[PDB]
Ligand binder design. Structure first.
Ligand SMILES: *[C@@H]1O[C@H](CO)[C@@H](O[C@@H]2O[C@H](CO)[C@@H](O[C@@H]3O[C@H](CO)[C@@H](O)[C@H](O[C@H]4O[C@H](CO)[C@@H](O)[C@H](O)[C@@H]4O[C@H]4O[C@H](CO)[C@@H](O)[C@H](O)[C@@H]4O)[C@@H]3O)[C@H](O)[C@H]2NC(C)=O)[C@H](O)[C@H]1NC(C)=O
Ligand SMILES: *[C@@H]1O[C@H](CO)[C@@H](O[C@@H]2O[C@H](CO)[C@@H](O[C@@H]3O[C@H](CO)[C@@H](O)[C@H](O[C@H]4O[C@H](CO)[C@@H](O)[C@H](O)[C@@H]4O)[C@@H]3O)[C@H](O)[C@H]2NC(C)=O)[C@H](O)[C@H]1NC(C)=O
Ligand code: BLA
Ligand SMILES: *[C@@H]1O[C@H](CO)[C@@H](O[C@@H]2O[C@H](CO)[C@@H](O)[C@H](O)[C@H]2NC(C)=O)[C@H](O)[C@H]1NC(C)=O
Ligand code: NAG
Ligand code: NAG
Ligand code: NAG
Ligand code: NAG
Ligand code: NAG
Ligand code: NAG
Ligand code: NAG
Ligand code: NAG
Ligand code: NAG
Ligand code: NAG
Ligand code: NAG
Lengths: 50, 50, 531, 100, 50
């Protein structure tokens, strides 16, 4: 970061990095669930397992 | 039919930007300019679609 | 501190130079990386004119040269100086540059950086003198009184004069908005003598000074030199001054957040092409460009020949306004609505609510027909004088339409109509609500559950009107207030009441900003043949 | 009530102006018992040629000449003092009492 | 509960309201509304705490 930087933005304009005010270190922010998840099932009347 | 959509209020006090901007201060101006902007943008989107 | 004087000086030669691509600054503090931004503001246009002011002097044959006039501070300045040694030391900001109005100084003392905003009694030639390569004296001002702001920074320079070919180039830009003065800084080493160096430069902010100052003029403080004697002589230096203009540019940022190059829109057709596509490199082909080569700067205003002052005296400073149930209407026409003349009176409005128009834009707009309604209310009934209200007054006495366009005025009058002539009444006990802009001056005796009791002594029949108990030494509320309601009407009819704007001369075949009875716009004016 | 964005009056045009899109808070409270006794130091500016800019002030006490300029004396026709005194004194109505 | 809310009978009294703010409804459209359950809270404040 810059010496007076406090948080970093992305081209989609959301904060992905921040500087901790107490200990001057740089952290990373990412969503706690990103990426798709697909569930494969047979018919619910047919079976129960997925 | 596209040039005749410019005579629509779209929920604003007037269809003319000059009537709004000369009668209201700058703070109250955006809340009624935005309606005209969104309506004209929607008209342009529709025209491009057909 | 004992300012020195000069007897004869040569007339300034206002030679004009060209600024190639200089005069760009960081316009905000948002951090960016690898993006191209199109921004609008006050910038110095490319290939603009810069006026030079020299200071060199020889031993004989020529008079002294000291070009320090009152340069106007219109919307911003580009100050670039190409001195050798250290001759130009700071600037003077102000409006009249005398001790009857506050002025600011920002100059290098020699051992400090001095910033003061005081009532300065400047001498004819502000300067500071050095002798034998040492800081001798500072001769900027004589007296300084009535001020608070003072900042001093430790700094050090070498005041010894040198010789050469102007190895230093220092440039600044200045602008003040919202009470903050902005100073930007850049430095690079060049080798030119009597011409403005070319290239591209970016200015970085160093100051943001919080004084609210009306700044319209500008002056430069210089330095004198002596060969260790009483007599003082000048040295070689020159600076350039440019004015900022409202225009659009495109800025390009790298991955470190610095600006590599910028494109000034509306200079040549090539820059306009890059200004629309938001890119520095353009592929071959034909492109449809937007409009940027338009600078409407002239303001033309046309208002009718109405000149008389509008009668605010007989509608505000009158006697015996009627009660609320018998309010009166007044038609106001063929006058000039100057609201500033009400400031001179002793009465101050505690309610200045406007509905259809903004209160600030009343000196520019004009109306086709206006009306005035005036009455007297209880004091805490004033909040019922509004669109869509409920109460005694809003239901039985005075109702405003919900599509109300106008303003409501109110002020407390406890010392004039609480002692004598206390015949103020309001209508209670009505069968049904009242319509907007209607009144009923009737004293029929009210009977509940069917009318026509025809006697006050019967059971259930009451007087409709109840008297305001106006008397001195009561609280706020239960105290008389005088209310004036103004109703506006903006149509295609000819205007009757128009406020105080000085009309200008008509100009045609130019892209200007016009105003025809509150019909502001942008375009050209051409003689017509329509009926 | 004139200490607000987009206001008109004596204070909002000649004394103190807040800019549009102002971010912050404004505070006010009545102080009648502390500064009403022989104060005689509270003034406001009338009679200015032109409106004031946001966050700016002018402390000047020159004579005001109506429809012109550069007045000489107070006895000259159409010449007034620019500053007018608040008439602060105890036992006056609310609305004439000082507020901080 | 189980009453007819006639606000016009308060005009006959000697007390006048300095505050009649309403939230979620309009003061004019109270003679036509018909509520399911209402509650009342009453206390005394300093005057500039209103
Ligand atoms: C313009 O002016 C005209 C006249 O100048 C205004 O017209 C008047 O309008 C009012 C109301 O709209 C009207 O008052 C009614 O008159 C009736 C007689 O025709 C009364 O009988 C009536 O009172 C009772 O009768 C109704 C039927 O019984 C009840 O529904 C009503 O609530 C009253 O009943 C009471 O008593 C019973 C007893 O048990 C009780 O059960 C009820 O609950 C209630 O307590 C009204 O008072 C006038 O008569 C009209 N005037 C004329 C000359 O006709 C007109 O309104 C004005 N326009 C505007 C816009 O202001
Ligand atoms: C910063 O300070 C400067 C100077 O201190 C200040 O400039 C002043 O502006 C006012 C108004 O803009 C000027 O006052 C007017 O001056 C003209 C002459 O140019 C006079 O004619 C005016 O008098 C009447 O004119 C008309 C009749 O001919 C009338 O229609 C009109 O209503 C006037 O009654 C009027 O006095 C003043 O002259 C300048 N001062 C100087 C030294 O130039 C500037 O406004 C300040 N900036 C801000 C933002 O306040
Ligand atoms: C009076 C205003 C004034 C300003 C705005 C100013 C700013 C300024 N002067 C600098 C350097 C310097 N300042 C000067 C001299 C000047 N440069 C000037 O802007 C002027 C007017 C002089 C006057 C002689 C010199 C010689 C240096 C060299 C500092 C070094 O060795 O790094 C620097 C770069 C180093 C630093 O951040 O300290 C800044 C930002 N100095 C000033 O004196
Ligand atoms: C404020 O400015 C005025 C005039 O600009 C000053 O009055 C002059 O002071 C000089 C002192 O060098 C006298 O010689 C002149 O006779 C004075 N009058 C005029 C009309 O020039 C004044 O001294 C300044 N300072 C204050 C008032 O503190
Ligand atoms: C802030 O205080 C904590 C608590 O002791 C300390 O650990 C930390 O180093 C401090 N941060 C500073 C001084 O920047
Ligand atoms: C599940 O499928 C069987 C076989 O077709 C069918 O008989 C049964 O009705 C189905 N279950 C439901 C809940 O429809
Ligand atoms: C010097 O000043 C005097 C008085 O202003 C003037 O008459 C004279 O011409 C000046 N000298 C020159 C060389 O111009
Ligand atoms: C700028 O300077 C040139 C000569 O250097 C002159 O011809 C021109 O009129 C000046 N002004 C403008 C606006 O170009
Ligand atoms: C300015 O410099 C002089 C010496 O040239 C010094 O005496 C004085 O103290 C300096 N000013 C300030 C405010 O320190
Ligand atoms: C101005 O400064 C001088 C010193 O140069 C001093 O004698 C004079 O009293 C000052 N003026 C005022 C009004 O204090
Ligand atoms: C300005 O100075 C004068 C004396 O020179 C003084 O009477 C007055 O109170 C001062 N005003 C301010 C606002 O400091
Ligand atoms: C950007 O910053 C890095 C890190 O300080 C530096 O190595 C590099 O030279 C700078 N410039 C460019 C164009 O990457
Ligand atoms: C009307 O103005 C006169 C002076 O012009 C003043 O004495 C009087 O009190 C005013 N009446 C009002 C404001 O009702
Ligand atoms: C303002 O009021 C005073 C009296 O209070 C009066 O003498 C004067 O003529 C009025 N008008 C102006 C422009 O001062
Ligand atoms: C109104 O108040 C009076 C007393 O002020 C009372 O006699 C009367 O019964 C009340 N009601 C009506 C409908 O007048």
């Amino acid at each position: 970061f810059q010496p007076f930087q406090q948080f970093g933005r992305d081209v989609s304009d959301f904060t992905d990095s921040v500087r901790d005010p107490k200990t001057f270190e740089i952290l990373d922010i990412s969503p706690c669930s990103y990426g798709g998840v697909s569930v494969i099932t047979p018919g619910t009347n047919t079976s129960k397992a997925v | 039919t596209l040039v005749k959509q410019l005579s629509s209020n779209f929920g604003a006090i007037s269809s003319v930007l000059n009537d709004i901007l000369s009668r209201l201060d700058k703070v109250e101006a955006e809340v009624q300019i935005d309606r005209l902007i969104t309506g004209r943008l929607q008209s342009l989107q529709t025209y491009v679609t057909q | 501190e004992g300012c020195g004087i000069l007897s004869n000086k040569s007339n300034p030669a206002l030679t004009q130079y060209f600024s190639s691509r200089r005069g760009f600054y960081y316009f905000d503090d948002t951090f960016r990386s690898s993006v191209r931004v199109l921004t609008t503001g006050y910038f110095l246009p490319f290939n603009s004119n810069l006026t030079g002011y020299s200071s060199r002097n020889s031993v004989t044959g020529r008079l002294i040269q000291f070009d320090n006039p009152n340069i106007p501070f219109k919307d911003g300045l580009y100050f670039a100086a190409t001195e050798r040694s250290n001759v130009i030391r700071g600037w003077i900001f102000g409006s009249t540059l005398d001790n009857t109005t506050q002025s600011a100084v920002l100059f290098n003392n020699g051992t400090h950086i001095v910033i003061n905003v005081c009532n300065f009694y400047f001498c004819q030639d502000p300067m500071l003198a050095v002798a034998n390569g040492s800081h001798f004296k500072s001769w900027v001002f004589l007296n300084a009184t009535n001020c608070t702001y003072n900042r001093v920074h430790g700094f050090e320079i070498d005041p010894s004069p040198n010789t050469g070919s102007f190895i230093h180039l220092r440039e600044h830009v200045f602008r003040n908005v919202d009470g903050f003065l902005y100073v930007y800084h850049n430095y690079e080493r060049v080798d030119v003598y009597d011409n403005f160096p070319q290239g591209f430069s970016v200015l970085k902010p160093i100051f943001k000074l919080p004084f609210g100052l009306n700044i319209t003029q500008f002056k430069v403080i210089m330095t004198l030199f002596s060969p260790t004697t009483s007599s003082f002589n000048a040295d070689a230096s020159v600076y350039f001054v440019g004015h900022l203009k409202p225009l659009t540019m495109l800025a390009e940022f790298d991955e470190n957040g610095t600006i590599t190059d910028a494109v000034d829109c509306s200079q040549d057709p090539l820059s306009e092409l890059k200004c629309t596509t938001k890119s520095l490199t353009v592929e071959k082909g034909i492109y449809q460009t937007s409009n940027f080569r338009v600078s409407p700067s002239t303001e033309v205003v046309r208002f009718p020949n109405i000149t008389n002052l509008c009668p605010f005296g007989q509608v505000f400073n009158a006697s015996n306004f009627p009660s609320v149930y018998a309010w009166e209407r007044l038609r106001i026409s063929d006058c000039v609505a100057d609201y500033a003349v009400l400031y001179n009176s002793s009465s101050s409005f505690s309610t200045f609510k406007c509905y259809g128009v903004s209160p600030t834009k009343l000196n520019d707009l004009c109306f086709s027909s206006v009306y005035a309604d005036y009455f007297v209310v209880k004091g805490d009934d004033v909040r019922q004088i509004a669109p869509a209200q409920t109460g005694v007054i809003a239901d039985y006495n005075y109702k405003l339409p919900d599509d109300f366009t106008g303003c409501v005025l109110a002020w407390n009058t406890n010392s004039v109509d609480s002692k004598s002539g206390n015949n103020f009444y309001y209508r209670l006990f009505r069968h049904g609500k009242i319509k907007p802009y209607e009144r009923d001056i009737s004293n029929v005796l009210y009977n509940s559950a069917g009318g026509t009791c025809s006697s006050i002594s019967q059971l259930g029949c009451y007087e409709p009107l109840k008297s305001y108990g106006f008397t001195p030494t009561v609280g706020v509320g239960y105290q008389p207030y005088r209310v004036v309601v103004l109703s506006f009407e903006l149509l295609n009819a000819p205007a009757t009441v128009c406020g105080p704007k000085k009309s200008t001369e008509l100009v045609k075949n130019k892209c200007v900003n016009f105003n025809f009875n509150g019909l502001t716009g942008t375009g050209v004016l051409t003689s017509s043949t329509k009926k």
